[PDB]
Structures are given as C-alpha cells and as structure tokens.
Design a binder for this molecule. Structure first.
Ligand code: CNC
Lengths: 621, 335
C-alpha cells in the first residue's frame, strides 16, 4: 500500500504518542531521542542547533504549515522554541527528498503541520508540571466542533529560576590561611547563574469545512519568550543580567479544493518577528533590536491522469523585510516545481522532479531529481529505492547585506547527492511487527559559504570549502505482545556520518584537510522502549553520540575534549478514570544514572532531576 | 553506559629561561590556554596550566607579568587574575571579583594598578593579600565606553592608553592616585610602550569601519616623556588595523604588525619602505622580541579555529623554529 506521492522517498514520521508524551519537550528534545539527528543543545531552554547528514545548521530547511520558518538573517532556527504539543504531525525528509517540497535543503527538510481535530461538542484539557529546580510547566486546551467548525486554542507557559547544583571539574576553590597562604584544593559545587527564563506560547486554530470538497483554515501562533544567557563553567567573579527576548507571530491561511480527479491548494501567510538583546549591570551597556516582516504565498496543484500516472505543479513566494537597527534589506523568493510520477507495473516506480528557484535578482540553475523504487520480493516486502539530485542553496540575507562585510556577489552552494536504500516489513498477526530500513548516501558540496577575514579588516564569505559527506543510516521498529496484557515496543535508529573537508589547504599549514568537521559526531544511535500493562506505563529513552571535535584540525587537547554522550531518561505513567474527569499521573526522571556529563564545551550540566505531571481531562455529559 | 573524566596533576620543572605564549582562545567558549616554550632545547609545552593544576585557565587569556619568581596570569573574560609559580606552574593565589581586567603593572610590592574594560575605575590591589584596595576615577569616562590598557612607569607617573571606544591618554600620579594630565590622540590607541630615548611609542587602530564611535585612517604617534606632549605623527593610510607595538631588550628598535611586521629603529624620521616580513598568507596576531638574544617571535592566529603557530626568526630574518600552541595566540612573556 505504497502511496504514489511516497515513491522512492526516504522519510520518517513521528507518531501521536511520540509528540504527546510530555509538555516540557521542545522539538530539540524530540529529535535528539527519536532520530539519528545530531542536535547541538546544551540543556533545556537554550539555543539548539541541528546538523543533518553531516551538514551545517543552515542546510536543514524547516516549514510549519508550508511556510518556511528559518530566520531570514541566519538561515537556521532554534528548535528549542517549538513546544511538542503545538505540533500535531511532523516529518523528516532526508537529503534528496527535500527537493519534493523545499529548495536549498542540502541536508534535509523538517515539515511541521497541525491536523484538524475530530471532536464533537465542547472539551478541555489542563496539565500541570511540577518538577525539580523550581520548574513549573502548564498547558491548557480548549476545543469545539459542530460538523462544520473546529475551533482550538492552546497556551503553554514554562518558567524556572534554572539554578541547579553541578560539580565543577573545570574550576577549583581554594582554602586560605591566617597568612593568605594555601591549605587545600577541592572541586566546588555551585549553582547555575543567570539562567532564569520564562516562555509563553499561544496557538489559535479555526478550521471550516463546507462538505462540498472545499476546506478552509486559519492558524495563528503567537510566541513570547524571555530567556537569559547562562554563565560559563569557569565564570567566577563579579549585579548582572543578560536576556534575549523574542516576540513572534506566525499566521497561515489555507484553502483546499478537492475534486473527483484533481486537487488544487492555495495558502497564504504572514510572520512578524521581533528580537531584543539586553546586557545591563549595576546601565545600558549593550542594546540590539531586530525586526522581521515576512509575507508568504503558495499555490499547488495535483492532477491524476490515471492510477499509474500523476502530475503536480507548485508555485511559492516569500518576501522578507528586515529593519534591524540599534540596515533596510529585503528579498523575494520564487520557487516553482513540477513533478511527474509514473508506475508502469506493480513492481516498478519512477519519479522525476524539476524545480526552479529565483532568490532576489539571481536565477539558480534548474534543480533536477530522480526517484526510482523497485520491489525485490513481496514475501517479506523487501523494497529497494534509489534517488539522485543536484541541489542549490542561496546565501542568507546576512551574508549579502551585512553592512561592514556584505558581498552581494556570492554564488549559491551546489551539492550532488545520490543514495541507495533497502527496506523490509515482516509482521505476524498479533504476535510481532518488525520493520526497518538501511540507506547508503553520498554527497559532495561545492562553494560552501565560509566567513573569512579580509585584508581590510572585516569578514566576508568567499565560498570554497569543498565538503564530502557520506555514510549509512539504519532504522528499526519492533512491537510484540508477550501476554494478553503486556505490550513491548522497541524503536532504534543508527547512523554513521563522516564529514570530511576536501577543500584545498587555506594556508601552508592547516591540519583541517581530510578531517571531520567540528561538532559533528562520527557515529550516532538512539534507542527507545515502551512497556504498558493495563493503565501502567513505563517508557525508556536512550541516545548515543560519539566524540565531537571542537577544532577543525581534530587536534588532541586536554582542554578541548568532549567524551561520547550517552543519556538515559525514564518515565512511569499511571492513568485514573474518575466520574467527572480523567486523571493521568506520570513522573519523569532525567539523567537517570546521575553522570556529571558535558555536551558543549565549558557549559555546566544538571544532575539527576525529576518532573511530575498532573493531567485533567473533564468528561462532560 | 556511563561517563568519567576529572583531572590529574603532573610534575613540571622549568628547565630553562623559556617563553610563555599567552593563548587567548575563543570568545564565549572558555577554551583559553597557556603554553611554555624553551628556546634552547627547542621543545614546546602546551597546556601547562591545565596539566599542572587540573583546572582550566578561563576565557580570553590576555596577558602575563612575571615579577621576581612569580607570574601573574590575566584572564579577561573571567574577571580573575592568577598568580602561579614560574618553576612548577602551580597556583599560589588569585584575585577575583574584578569587572574585566586587561593589564597589570606593579608600582611596588604593595600597589599594583589593574586596567579594565567596560569600566572607568582602575583597580588597586595588594598582591600579598589578593584583596581590592581602591579605585582610580577616570574623568569624562563611562562604563559604556570603558577602556584601559598598557601602563608605563616614568619616575612617579603611569601612562595608560584607553583603547576601546576611546581616543585619550591618561597620566596617573602614583603618590596621590589621581590623573594629572591628558592628551587626545587618534581613534582607539591599541598599545603603549617605552623606549630608551624617553619617547612614548604608540599606534592608533582605525577600527571597524561603520563603528558607532567612528572610522579613521590608522596612525602612529611619538610622545615625549618628560613633557607629556605629542612630538611626531605617522599615517598608515585607510587600510589595515595595526596593533601590538613592541621593542627589543635594548629598547632601540620598534616592532608592530600592520600586516607587514615593521622592524625600524628608534629616533628615525620615516617608515622604512621594506617589510621585515612579507605578511605571506595568514592573519598574524602577536609579536615579541627576545631581550637576551634578539630573536623575533611572531604569533600567527591562522583562521581562529585551530592551533596557531609562532615563527621564530633571528634579527636578520633567518627562520629558526616553528611550533604549535593553543587557539589564537595573543601575547608573550619572558620568564
Ligand atoms: C576580529 C575581531 C576580534 N575581536 Co573584537 C577586537 N579587537 N573585533 C574583531 C574585528 C571584527 C569582528 C567582526 N565581527 O568582523 C574588530 C577589530 C573590528 C572587532 C571589533 C571589536 N571588538 C572589540 C573588543 C574589545 C573585542 N573583540 C574580541 C572579541 C576580538 C576577538 C578575539 C578572540 N580571541 O576571539 C577577535 C580578534 C576574533 C573574533 C573572531 O573572529 N572569532 C572567531 C569567530 C569565527 O567566532 P565567533 O565567536 O563567531 O566570532 C564572532 C565574535 O567574536 C564577533 N565579535 C568580534 N568582536 C566582538 C565584540 C563583542 C563584544 C562581541 C559580543 C562579539 C564580537 O566577531 C565574530 C563574528 O564576526 C576581544 C576578545 C579582543 C580582546 N583581546 O579583548 C574583545 C572582547 C572584550 C571583552 N572582554 O568582552 C571592540 C569593542 C573593539 C573596537 N572598538 O573595535 C569591537 C566590538 C564591536 C561591538 N560589538 O561593539
């Protein structure tokens, strides 16, 4: 039952229970434990960066309800500012698959959407999070539906002083004497400083259905954040505050007109973004204001010639306007794509996608992509697939118009990608269900944009930096019914992703050639397990990241070493069904074995910490 | 399925009159490092402070001053200035609670003024007690533009240049702990040094074209010592950002980066056309001259994301040694 749109495509989808398991998990925590993606995130409520298939952050396109969410100046998004309950359906497109929907997704594409509800009458939900470190989390839900309307409203608030006890293995506190001499050294135990934060997220959804094939919708997603910047591990000495407020409104309007044979979709949106940087101490030491105005539009078509042939067309247009001060710049972004999918016999399948991109005043070359799929054996659903493409990514808005170092003459990066994969799905009726896949990918990136110093005394990108990215990615899902009341599920992902810098040595002596790129683990694997018995629920999540290099040269140093990162989080859930309500009690233990770990250089980490949730879902008449 | 680490001390013994490479490290990353090189045995010891103390140096390791047999290490981005043994690389005391120290000069065994950025007070500390004593109030000078740098003793007065977002020189009287004079020089004077001919030597970086303070052609200045007054000015056009002026042991030849390291003698009248070094393909950051022999050590920052190198040349230009140090070497000090 392969969907025709899903022909020769390597993608993964997150289930409902994956996203709806905790109210404190942003998308940074979702991707860390539920995929092979490396997520450079040094804690909770902090700047999270995603490196996908050995590429940088900017090579991971993100689209919420169709419109791109990447910061226009930077091109990369903080996945820690997206609550999981605010996302109802998420997908990952690996490499060549990002051509089907997006443009310069050299690494991959992250697609987020909110499915309309199917609840009749009035309903409500309220959950409260009581956790250690004086952290409080809340989430309120209000929904209604009357066969022609689906009104929803969510509001998530998270706050915490965020001052936890950690042991400094990078600092030592001394004991003086009567003559200001030394007596003994000991590793102190201190508290995180200037880490306090508070976030507010509101999502308002209005969906209308006509019953004649026309569907309408309107989603508005307002975000208010006030997060401080944490102090370093070796930051001792002194009356200090440093905050990064962030106000964002994201609205999308949609209309869908299906028919008996064809389908046409039209969407429009608007994003207002406002960032403020404050650095004061006992005084306006530093100020920064960033304002982004963005308009979005898209029209998509989809026509069936038959059950074996399919044609699609699509036009998109973004318009970013920036007035960053404390300067005027903008860019229109057209992107037209045409795809044709042909399925001659029951075993074979082809797919050709043509894309055209025009960012600003420069036309990128045609972006082709071919997807082929074949069925080796229906006995065990052994299916093999292969794809190939040449993709282009435009320079970000900063690299073009950054006032002291902007060069509007940059050329878009180019990347040739090809990959081959296999998959299988062998299941037994009410006994076991095992499925998995393995794909080999190989990619070469040319003209990678790298900011470099200039002889005049400022920074300017100079392209260059040929990069070779390749490796193996393996997925595996397992479910089994041990008894009539015990169910066990196992989900495992593994990835070996070298990222070799093939570029010419910049100078006479650079040990960076032929070496792994900084902050990209060579190996990566995650494993999650779930066991449920009646209303009792036990969940286990485990992630593994190999050593991460902090220097281009990959030189061995004692002061720049990051060990392999293994973390284990366990949660026990109990559900109670009362008369007028339903109560769900669960308790989360993070950092189960209490290892004084380190995921980013010289940034403190918490110990073992606990989190308790109380969930109420009233049962009306 | 666990993790471990922690530090372990090891014995160190300074076997020669070595050179201390003062690696700055990155900024908001806490990867500052200290290194030691022996000019005779031609062997370099990296990360001397971490291995000999099992605790990291800090962030933006700025400068080091060695007095008698004790060496003071300045960590700018951690508000701490250390004091370590010059023989075993072990800590014997520290001064904390500062705002943002840059440079330290010891008036005597009791008073040692400490310079700062983002502050208009010069700290006064007692090295033997590691306790703050007082502050020196800089006129017409505020936090939002706070800047103090190299200090040079002349009889009873100390001259300091205000680098960041500042264009003035301050003369401080040690007895009364108050400024007594001022001169207005070009934008952002970087470093201040002293020569034998009693002529204050300094240069002014242009600085970050498009800066709120302003952008100007970098210049070079010579200031009389006895009479605090400008004497001669040199212009280095609009390009490049000069920094890090230095002298030799005899105090008679001037060195500064300006891309092409310029080796020109004191009491000259013009900038020599030829470069002492050609500024081949990298971004130099540090510079020093041996006071005992005359060797020239030039610190190369490469690309700010990997280990730099120091190129050791003689006073003629003969290549001698090229060795590796921590990330972004920035300064030197002689044991
Ligand atoms: C080159 C450089 C550097 N700079 Co400037 C110098 N000299 N800087 C610059 C040049 C341009 C930087 C650029 N963006 O193009 C230069 C000379 C114009 C410049 C200017 C400034 N800098 C300044 C200062 C003092 C500093 N700078 C350093 C960071 C000093 C650095 C020393 C060091 N050890 O890091 C430095 C040598 C290396 C930066 C780098 O490339 N890092 C590697 C890079 C790949 O990683 P990164 O972390 O993303 O780097 C970014 C930041 O460091 C940023 N950046 C640069 N300067 C600052 C200053 C601040 C406050 C901040 C928040 C960021 C920066 O530049 C990079 C992006 O281009 C500093 C550590 C030097 C020192 N030894 O004291 C110091 C910070 C002091 C402190 N305790 O906070 C200025 C006030 C000086 C001036 N008046 O020109 C000014 C700050 C501007 C402002 N925001 O108000």
């Amino acid at each position: 039952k392969r969907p025709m749109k899903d022909i020769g495509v390597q993608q993964t989808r997150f289930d409902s229970l994956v996203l709806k398991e905790n109210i404190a998990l942003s998308m940074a925590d979702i991707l860390t434990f539920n995929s092979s993606i490396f997520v450079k995130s040094y804690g909770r409520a902090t700047l999270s960066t995603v490196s996908f298939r050995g590429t940088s952050a900017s090579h991971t396109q993100v689209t919420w309800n169709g419109m791109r969410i990447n910061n226009p100046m930077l091109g990369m998004t903080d996945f820690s500012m997206i609550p999981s309950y605010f996302i109802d359906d998420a997908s990952l497109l690996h490499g060549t698959s990002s051509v089907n929907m997006a443009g310069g997704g050299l690494g991959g594409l992250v697609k987020l959407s909110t499915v309309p509800a199917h609840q009749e009458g009035f309903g409500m939900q309220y959950v409260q999070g009581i956790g250690s470190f004086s952290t409080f989390d809340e989430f309120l839900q209000l929904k209604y539906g009357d066969k022609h309307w689906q009104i929803s409203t969510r509001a998530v608030y998270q706050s915490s002083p965020n001052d936890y006890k950690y042991r400094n293995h990078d600092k030592k506190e001394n004991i003086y004497d009567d003559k200001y001499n030394i007596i003994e050294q000991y590793y102190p135990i201190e508290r995180n400083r200037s880490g306090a934060y508070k976030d507010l997220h509101i999502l308002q959804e209005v969906y209308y259905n006509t019953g004649k094939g026309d569907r309408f919708g309107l989603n508005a997603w307002y975000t208010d954040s006030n997060r401080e910047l944490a102090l370093l591990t070796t930051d001792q000495g002194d009356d200090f505050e440093n905050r990064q407020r962030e106000h964002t409104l994201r609205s999308v309007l949609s209309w869908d007109h299906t028919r008996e044979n064809w389908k046409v979709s039209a969407r429009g949106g608007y994003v207002h973004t406002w960032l403020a940087y404050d650095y004061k101490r006992d005084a306006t030491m530093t100020r920064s204001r960033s304002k982004v105005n963005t308009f979005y539009g898209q029209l998509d078509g989809e026509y069936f010639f038959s059950d074996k042939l399919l044609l699609t067309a699509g036009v998109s247009a973004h318009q970013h306007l920036v007035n960053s001060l404390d300067f005027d710049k903008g860019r229109i972004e057209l992107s037209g794509n045409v795809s044709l999918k042909w399925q001659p016999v029951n075993r074979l399948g082809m797919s050709l996608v043509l894309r055209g991109e025009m960012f600003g005043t420069k036309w990128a070359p045609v972006i082709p992509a071919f997807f082929v799929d074949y069925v080796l054996s229906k006995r065990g659903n052994i299916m093999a697939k292969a794809s190939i493409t040449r993709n282009y990514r435009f320079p970000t808005l900063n690299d073009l118009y950054f006032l002291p170092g902007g060069n509007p003459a940059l050329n878009n990066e180019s990347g040739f990608t090809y990959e081959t994969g296999l998959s299988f799905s062998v299941d037994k009726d009410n006994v076991y269900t095992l499925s998995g896949s393995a794909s080999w990918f190989d990619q070469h990136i040319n003209d990678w944009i790298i900011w470099l110093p200039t002889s005049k005394g400022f920074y300017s990108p100079v392209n260059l930096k040929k990069v070779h990215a390749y490796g193996v990615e393996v997925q595996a899902d397992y479910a089994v019914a041990i008894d009539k009341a015990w169910k066990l599920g196992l989900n495992g992902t593994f990835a070996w992703t070298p990222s070799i810098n093939e570029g010419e040595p910049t100078s006479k002596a650079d040990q960076s050639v032929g070496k792994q790129l900084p902050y990209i683990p060579e190996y990566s694997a995650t494993l999650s397990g779930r066991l449920t018995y009646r209303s009792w629920g036990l969940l286990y999540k485990w992630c593994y990241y190999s050593e991460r290099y902090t220097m281009t040269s990959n030189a061995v140093s004692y002061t720049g070493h990051l060990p392999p990162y293994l973390m284990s989080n366990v949660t026990l859930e109990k559900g109670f069904s009362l008369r007028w309500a339903d109560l769900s009690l669960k308790g989360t233990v993070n950092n189960l074995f209490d290892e004084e770990y380190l995921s980013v250089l010289s940034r403190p980490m918490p110990g073992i910490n606990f989190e308790f949730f109380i969930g109420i879902t009233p049962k009306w008449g | 399925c666990m993790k471990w680490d922690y530090g372990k001390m090891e014995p160190f013994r300074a076997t020669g009159d070595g050179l201390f490479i003062m690696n700055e490290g990155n900024f908001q990353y806490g990867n500052a490092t200290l290194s030691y090189y022996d000019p005779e045995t031609k062997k370099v010891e990296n990360e001397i402070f971490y291995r000999a103390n099992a605790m990291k140096l800090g962030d933006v390791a700025q400068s080091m001053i060695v007095r008698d047999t004790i060496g003071w290490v300045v960590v700018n981005n951690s508000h701490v200035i250390f004091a370590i043994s010059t023989n075993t690389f072990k800590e014997v005391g520290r001064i904390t609670g500062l705002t943002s120290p840059r440079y330290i000069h010891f008036i005597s065994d009791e008073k040692a003024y400490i310079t700062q950025i983002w502050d208009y007070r010069i700290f006064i500390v007692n090295p033997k007690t590691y306790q703050i004593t007082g502050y020196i109030e800089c006129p017409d000078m505020t936090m939002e533009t706070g800047s103090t740098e190299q200090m040079v003793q002349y009889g009873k007065y100390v001259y300091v240049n205000c680098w960041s977002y500042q264009n003035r020189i301050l003369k401080i009287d040690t007895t009364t702990d108050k400024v007594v004079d001022q001169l207005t020089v070009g934008i952002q004077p970087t470093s201040l040094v002293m020569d034998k001919n009693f002529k204050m030597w300094t240069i002014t970086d242009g600085g970050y074209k498009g800066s709120p303070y302003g952008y100007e052609e970098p210049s070079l200045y010579r200031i009389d010592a006895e009479t605090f007054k400008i004497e001669k000015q040199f212009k280095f056009q609009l390009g490049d950002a000069p920094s890090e002026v230095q002298l030799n042991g005899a105090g008679d030849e001037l060195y500064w980066i300006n891309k092409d390291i310029w080796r020109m003698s004191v009491d000259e009248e013009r900038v020599p056309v030829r470069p002492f070094l050609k500024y081949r393909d990298t971004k130099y950051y540090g510079l020093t001259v041996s006071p005992k022999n005359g060797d020239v050590y030039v610190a190369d920052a490469i690309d700010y994301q990997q280990q730099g190198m120091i190129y050791r040349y003689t006073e003629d230009g003969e290549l001698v040694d090229e060795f590796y140090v921590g990330i972004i070497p920035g300064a030197f000090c002689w044991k």
